[PDB]
Amino acid sequence: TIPHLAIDPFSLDFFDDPYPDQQTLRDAGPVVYLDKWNVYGVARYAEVHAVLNDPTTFCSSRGVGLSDFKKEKPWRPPSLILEADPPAHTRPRAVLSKVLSPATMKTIRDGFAAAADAKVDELLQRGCIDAIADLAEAYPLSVFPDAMGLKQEGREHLLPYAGLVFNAFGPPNELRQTAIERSAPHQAYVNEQCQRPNLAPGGFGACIHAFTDTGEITPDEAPLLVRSLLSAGLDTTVNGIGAAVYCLARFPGELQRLRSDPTLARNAFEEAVRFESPVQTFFRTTTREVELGGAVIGEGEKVLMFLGSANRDPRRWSDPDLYDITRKTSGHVGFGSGVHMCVGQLVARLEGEVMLSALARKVAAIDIDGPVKRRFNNTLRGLESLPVKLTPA
Ligand code: HEM
Numbered sequence: 001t002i003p004h005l006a007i008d009p010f011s012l013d014f015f016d017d018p019y020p021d022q023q024t025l026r027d028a029g030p031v032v033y034l035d036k037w038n039v040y041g042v043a044r045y046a047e048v049h050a051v052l053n054d055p056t057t058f059c060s061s062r063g064v065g066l067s068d069f070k071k072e073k074p075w076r077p078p079s080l081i082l083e084a085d086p087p088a089h090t091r092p093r094a095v096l097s098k099v100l101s102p103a104t105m106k107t108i109r110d111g112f113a114a115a116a117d118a119k120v121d122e123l124l125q126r127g128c129i130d131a132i133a134d135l136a137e138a139y140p141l142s143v144f145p146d147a148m149g150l151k152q153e154g155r156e157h158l159l160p161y162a163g164l165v166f167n168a169f170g171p172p173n174e175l176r177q178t179a180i181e182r183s184a185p186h187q188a189y190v191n192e193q194c195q196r197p198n199l200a201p202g203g204f205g206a207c208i209h210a211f212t213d214t215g216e217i218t219p220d221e222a223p224l225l226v227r228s229l230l231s232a233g234l235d236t237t238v239n240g241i242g243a244a245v246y247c248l249a250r251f252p253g254e255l256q257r258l259r260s261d262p263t264l265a266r267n268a269f270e271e272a273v274r275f276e277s278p279v280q281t282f283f284r285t286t287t288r289e290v291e292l293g294g295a296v297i298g299e300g301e302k303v304l305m306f307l308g309s310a311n312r313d314p315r316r317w318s319d320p321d322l323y324d325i326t327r328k329t330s331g332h333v334g335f336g337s338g339v340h341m342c343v344g345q346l347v348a349r350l351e352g353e354v355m356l357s358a359l360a361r362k363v364a365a366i367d368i369d370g371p372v373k374r375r376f377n378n379t380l381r382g383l384e385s386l387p388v389k390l391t392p393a
């Protein structure tokens with residue numbers, strides 16, 4: 001009943017151009033079996049959405065990578081939020097939700113915006129820049145570690161640590177095994193900075209620790225929650241902003257619409273998240289026999305959700321392959337959906353918004369003027385290098 005496919009969604013060939021293979025995965029059926037890794041796959045919007053929204057049947061506590069925590073040792077202590085199910089999940093989630101709240105956004109907004117304006121000003125002085133190193137990396141590096149309350153020393157460990165985390169959700173290919181074999185210094189650094197004494201007052205980190213006396217989390221839980229933010233909070237935004245600039249570079253008509261109305265910045269970023277889906281994939285594990293899209297899946301099976309594919313499913317989206325900054329994006333699954341839906345999305349959107357606003361007001365054109373190089377990662381989609389010429393407005 002379930003078609004079997006030999007496509008490796010974690011191969012460099014796939015990362016290099018995933019879209020044909022994603023259509024093959026969607027059109028093969030609502031549920032496929034991926035023989036390469038012995039997992040089920042869902043690539044259409046409807047099934048991806050259904051799976052995300054049934055956490056009881058499709059759990060996270062057995063890991064959201066290929067590895068089944070019931071069978072293998074997790075490479076690091078499990079995340080108390082990403083790799084937990086309700087009810088264990090519920091209070092740590094509530095804490096990070098309050099730490100990364102509307103009120104918090106109000107306190108950091110002017111600073112994040114000034115930094116974005118300053119960066120664009122600097123880049124315009126240079127003219128010819130690398131929009132990855134000099135913008136998509138440099139801008140989040142200039143605001144997020146400080147917002148966390150990290151010391152200056154050791155920050156060069158943060159992106160390596162993130163690349164390791166997102167590679168480790170993958171199968172045991174070379175990407176994953178190389179990451180893990182280089183991991184020790186990055187782990188050591190990150191774990192140390194998660195301790196209360198090492199986090200500056202007023203940062204996200206200290207704020208997590210301040211929540212330890214409410215009964216929601218205990219003091220021994222706070223370091224792992226800080227670890228979640230240091231895992232997820234940077235490299236995601238790097239690839240989101242990189243995606244947005246790439247889109248604007250490839251669709252000059254949309255840059256021009258954004259210039260004429262900079263208040264489109266926020267949606268222009270959201271559309272970039274749907275269109276590129278910097279977070280491509282996550283797994284769930286079935287806790288029982290389940291029927292999905294008229295197909296039956298046994299208990300304890302890994303299920304691979306293609307978020308990027310769901311965000312380009314023509315069953316859900318009109319002209320999915322077009323970057324449209326006035327699209328109604330609501331419902332896209334680039335931040336996930338349901339109880340695990342990105343708890344940091346207000347930070348991601350804030351960063352993305354103020355950067356695209358700065359570009360909207362200051363830049364007249366973005367032209368690719370060098371070879372584009374992709375960055376390969378088992379979970380993240382994005383570029384290594386994006387050489388562009390920026391023309392001032
Ligand atoms: C454009 C940037 C980002 C994208 C595309 C993104 C994507 C996602 C996705 C798809 C999930 C769902 C995982 C699942 O269902 O298993 C998620 C969860 C999560 N994200 Fe984000 N993320 C981004 C930025 C951030 C930022 C900036 C932070 C923190 C400051 C963050 C922290 C987290 C955490 C802690 C979770 C786990 C939430 C839970 O399990 O309840 N992310 N993110």
Ligand SMILES: CCOc1ccc(C(=O)O)cc1
Pocket residue numbers: 079080081082083165227228229231232236279
């Ligand atoms: C795209 C979401 O990525 C992550 C990665 C790690 C964690 C965590 O360590 O809790 C959460 C989300």
Ligand SMILES: [Cl-]
Pocket residue numbers: 076187190191
């Ligand atoms: Cl670690």
